[PDB]
């Protein structure tokens, strides 16, 4: 309050650098929440901490809780809500120096650290829904509405191709199946001019996305489906039925990737796509047990004389691996493939076929299916604990990926500053035991300074009447 | 709707429709069949195996691809989502 | 203390069964029986089941074999108690 | 099986490390000791929940309250000595 110069020492640290390194919250809070020099404290450049508002939210977030509470300045017109305006001045959530081509630097830092209370604070919420209601609301509504025109013309075109088939076979080229054909091929050309601009900005890290590869299989397959409506000899083959079934499946499976971002119907798609990532890593390890049993049933059940429709599925190696995977889901067929062929004296190797089947039932439909249940119970109760952070971390990555696509000259017109608006507990026990440790250190230092003085008094006290 | 329309494309124009494949001849009947075959009645060796060796399965290699990706995520992965909730 | 390992006994059943499988390729009258089909199915199953015991020690594919072989130790102790209900 | 999977998953970062050390432990016993001491290097030079934290801080504050209690009893003996031998002339009743 008397104007001290904020300088650096020989070991090139500042006064703020020691309060974050030694972790004294009430010492840093006396100078980032100062009345007149708060803005000069927040604008420092160092080596240990290149940006102080990114160093507070990483080290001690309860100090940054109070910096955000100073940015919501309410007017004193308490009567009738006539001029009771709340003034939102952000100024700290945007880091000029830490220059950097990172779009939302402060909000992306408090996501990688899991700071869910800073994200739910009413300064961060009003910073997001200012960026939402300016540009972001209309690059999300117009994206989900021009895909849902494509989804209803792939679904109609498949239902018209099945009701219009003749004879070699051919399609009755109707004016209704031709108008649905043109809307599909116009959408592919217009959305291939969007994913070639994307390759320039995402050179060779485009293949790692795995959502783009769904879109390239969907667009190629919807072109192979649509070609018999364009030829004079509008003939059909088994490559057009196969392309139509891949296009209709992937058109509706890609609609689930849009419903991640809604409310009350968006947390259940995050649970679906997280127990799907575990189940791919565990059905490549335990595809060794399908090659183990699937080759064992090929040895035992393929040379049965007079092969019935029961044992006709163990006559190949690729067909025995599909059969073994289906008979851990429940269709084991005990009394059709083992019992009635044993009493007709047709089972080739009797006592070993009941041994491989018995060890099958122990570990494939009991023990491997219970591994997959137990992995899915644990992943759902991990999303459900972190549900209020995954909704906020998805709201910020929506705007983060959307800033990188747009040109920067459009943003700075709509990048408003100083908005005026006219109308378990593990982190609480560990943040109070840490507070009582600093209190017992102050009691111990006050008591040692006092014990020096009491011990001095008896060295120099005058004793005359009560002398022995 | 994703799988139930995919099995309608692949399994509805099978010549001499048996009682097995008579449940994929409509779109409303294919959506009830798809919901019942995630509860356990998948009928692998009556609707896929015996029609493949009688040379009656219309689109062979794709019918075993849609069925294989069905078994991964509808009776395993979606039924385990409902247990875990 | 060799018999207490239980990984060595997998290897002795695998090596004997892969010798019974291979003997019809060594005889002049290369005849087959139902003991050679049975030895071939035990040898092929145990050859691929013993590959899972090597994948315990990798990363991201090694924790799921530890989960497999730990719910297998409990399921043997509980399917001998409740083989009384069968 | 649900309870055994959430017991491996909590102890996952220990079972990876306990398996890395039992790999080398069983491998030392097989090799002869004369080969090991050549490759047994010393002094390597390289040119380029929270139950154990609550119980380790409550135990730390117990030792701190014992030091405050012993400093305060040594001081209470001296303050009580001062009033036994303090000179009282002007403020005597």
Tab-separated table of C-alpha atoms in Angstrom, chain B residues 22-34:
chain	number	residue	atom	x	y	z
B	22	UNK	CA	-39.813	-64.971	-42.157
B	23	UNK	CA	-39.189	-62.491	-39.323
B	24	UNK	CA	-36.981	-60.210	-41.446
B	25	UNK	CA	-39.567	-59.544	-44.160
B	26	UNK	CA	-40.778	-56.243	-42.657
B	27	UNK	CA	-39.175	-53.221	-41.049
B	28	UNK	CA	-41.437	-53.361	-37.911
B	29	UNK	CA	-40.816	-57.109	-37.599
B	30	UNK	CA	-37.046	-56.751	-37.999
B	31	UNK	CA	-36.947	-54.319	-35.080
B	32	UNK	CA	-38.673	-56.787	-32.750
B	33	UNK	CA	-36.434	-59.617	-33.925
B	34	UNK	CA	-33.270	-57.573	-33.344
